[PDB]
Design a protein around this ligand. Sequence first.
Ligand SMILES: [Mg+2]
Ligand SMILES: [Mg+2]
Ligand SMILES: [Mg+2]
Lengths: 399, 390
Amino acid sequence: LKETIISDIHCIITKPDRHNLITVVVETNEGVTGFGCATFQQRPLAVKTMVDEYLKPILIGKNANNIEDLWQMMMVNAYWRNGPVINNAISGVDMALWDIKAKLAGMPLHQLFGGKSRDAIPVYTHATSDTMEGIYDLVEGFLEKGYKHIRCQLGFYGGVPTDLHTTQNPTEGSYYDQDQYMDNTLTMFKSLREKYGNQFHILHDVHERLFPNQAIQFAKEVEQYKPYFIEDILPPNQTEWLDNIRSQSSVSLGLGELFNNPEEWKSLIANRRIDFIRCHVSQIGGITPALKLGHLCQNFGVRIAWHCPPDMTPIGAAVNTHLNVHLHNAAIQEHVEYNGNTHKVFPNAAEPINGYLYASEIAGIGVEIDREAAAEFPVMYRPHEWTQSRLPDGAIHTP
Amino acid sequence: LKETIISDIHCIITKPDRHNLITVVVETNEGVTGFGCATFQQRPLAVKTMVDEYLKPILIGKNANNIEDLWQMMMVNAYWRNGPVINNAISGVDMALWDIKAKLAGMPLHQLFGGKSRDAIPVYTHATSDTMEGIYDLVEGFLEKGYKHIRCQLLHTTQNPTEGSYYDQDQYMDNTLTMFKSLREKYGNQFHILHDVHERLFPNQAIQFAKEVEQYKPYFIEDILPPNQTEWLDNIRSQSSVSLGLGELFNNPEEWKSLIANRRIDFIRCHVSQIGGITPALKLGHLCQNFGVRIAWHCPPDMTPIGAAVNTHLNVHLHNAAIQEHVEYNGNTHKVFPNAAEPINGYLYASEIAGIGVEIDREAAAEFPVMYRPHEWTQSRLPDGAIHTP
Ligand SMILES: [Mg+2]
Ligand SMILES: [Mg+2]
Ligand SMILES: [Mg+2]
């Protein structure tokens, strides 16, 4: 191995389907190119600015071989640090550098880490509908394709909650009722168990919709239905309330997709407040920190379920699968099918086979962006009105 | 009072002196204009992008009267939240809205809060030199001008060391203790002495240093640890009476909640725009009151005089406010931000007109466009070549 000098950096936003995806490209003097995911779907232009104006200058001419030093240097380079815009930008680079290292080694990414500790990683997918019948229909399809874990969400029929007790002139927003949500959800679990027994594992994402006292009552009522895990039962700033849950309930808990400051998870994990960490790899700054985080969780008996939503590149997904077959405490990989356009833009993206995702076996991450195709699907501004989540009295709730 | 509708929003970067400063402007239908600080000097274009591309579209047409609802809404609007780019963008808007509210009420900002709880806020300034005599000169000058609080600041490597800004922890520690020793010998207790460790130490070093410096009775020692290692303060608190300030780096509430609940510091040092502006600053000041912690907000040169006036407003209102850091502005800076206050005999007085009291002269600001700076100091390295938190 000789020094590997960074010659250029790029950032490309593309929307082949429903979401703005962000890819970072790292070129080297030697012609070895790396690709990484920097997807913060809500603020893509900020991430691109961060990469283009601030990360490029400090990277050009640097030795890409030393991923650790570059990561430590990048993370503190603005003095102020730890946020979704900065971390995603850094993640894109970090992943590209790891991709370059794997390509230089002639190895699949996970082989650099120490190779596999499992054969493939189990997968769950999303069945979301506004009627139970709509969920049943989705579940049947997934069961036939070989899935044994399914994330199930029952929304309000026609988007609107029933007889919302709201005010005379409600402030504009995306309204919902916490109590009806909890009942719909418990009805959902009850119905699924009556209809499917233990045919598959059921996951549900509370998505930080509840107040702490509501969270604790929900945990106890849902326990009988034995969810594979209940996700984000509280927002990141109220996780101390988990202690009251852990003392009186056996419910399995997942949390963390929102995290982008280590202080959000450190106490959480050291006190065993959750069973599955859910961090979005690019939100925490890339592969480098994800490895360390995996290892910390291992010490405290916490398993891993990285956030793998549709708002993420297949490059990001492939990286997570590499991480998932290597880290001994990885549990399951979230997955939503990519459309034709997405496959065109990121060729060779793996899809689950009989409920399993298999790591890429060529050199590198195994997935890149086809920039000619991406040019055909440029960024498009999206409001994400769902983030303006309001309760019936008009108040914002964490979305 | 009627609905106050937001008509337009601007984000202006200007560098009339040594630092890229960032200002948010909120215009209303009723022609009342608000100004706020969004200064993240290291990444100004990222904040501007945040404001122009993402905040503006969600704020136009909204009723500016309801700052609390707009703050809550803004903070979660990207789903992912906290962090310096988003929080500064939001802060510029939040401050502008408070400016608008104060102007509509025809009161100085602090009067909206509930009025004063002190007459003015005491001030410290900076004396930094590479020689003791150098510090002596600066101190004499400040003492002359009425200050009673002054922050004072005074190679074995490898064959081909990686490019960076290098320093030695042990030399820095030895030097600083020597600085304190000399100052007490020369000036006794003529003034309070402050020092900023600026997260340069490892935890074992920090504790050793805390014990050694205790005898010299600093007003506070600042940022003795990085925000991620503050649990190590327990060992310092159990055996040292040294006063500690910390937090200018904070931009996520989990960084301070436990710190304050466990009485691990004596002065909170948050940078108001980093935490999301006035709205959150009030709540944090209150939290600190409950636990007996005082406030010393971060007021560096890389902050607009608008941000500074806001801080003085907070400082005369919040009962547990302790002191305001201050560095003198240059002629240019004064031209871009007219009517900025300067200390009088070591005190800063809040503005007494309606609003924050300081605005941006948009004309003069254009004379000083954004200019890129590498900030090579943030690439801080120890002799073996390893990065250390800058
Ligand atoms: Mg989720
Ligand atoms: Mg084609
Ligand atoms: Mg400081």
